């Protein structure tokens, strides 16, 4: 119904902002990619999360879990591995909360 349609729109907006944050690392040296990504990611994610609080507060604990999964995987990774650890767990956890059965990326 209306709630699931609004949740899906928010999940899509979160993913699009996440992809835009990844784009900011294109021409950044490896050791600076995670800090660059994280600064870009936090601005747009916080705006998306506040939209969820307003329009679909039932989604907020699920979004919190996706972010925690990603931030915590990056937190424990060695510096050279932090960016890919975030990206991998954020994208997989977002597909899990969205109910997408193919969670590990399938190559085209
Ligand atoms: Zn930890
Ligand atoms: Zn398959
Ligand atoms: Zn996987």
Residue numbers in the entry: 2 to 109
Paper text:
In mutant S46Y, a buried polar amino acid was replaced by a hydrophobic amino acid. Such replacements have been referred to as “hydrophobic core packing” and reported to have stabilizing effects on the protein structure by increasing the overall hydrophobicity within the protein core. As predicted by MAESTRO, mutants E39L, N16M, and S46Y displayed an increased thermal stability compared to the WT protein (ΔT +8.8 to +14°C) whereas the destabilized mutant L89G was less heat stable (ΔT −5°C). A more detailed analysis with X-ray crystallography of mutant S46Y showed that the 3-dimensional structure was remarkably similar to that of the WT protein. The superimposition of the crystal structures of S46Y with Phl p 6 WT revealed that the overall fold is identical, with a total root-mean-square deviation of 0.42 A. As shown in Figure 5, the introduction of Tyr46 in the α2 helix, pointing into the central hydrophobic cavity, contributes to hydrophobic interactions with Phe42 within the α2 helix (and also Tyr68 in the neighboring α3 helix). In contrast, E39L and S46Y clearly showed delayed proteolytic processing, with S46Y being the most stable protein. We found that peptide 92–106 was much faster and more efficiently processed from L89G compared to the WT, whereas presentation was almost abrogated in the most rigid mutant S46Y. Despite the much slower protein degradation in vitro, S46Y turned out to be significantly more immunogenic in terms of IgG2a induction, while IgG1 levels, serum and cell bound IgE remained unaltered. On the contrary, the more stable mutant S46Y turned out to be more immunogenic and TH1 polarizing than the destabilized mutant L89G.
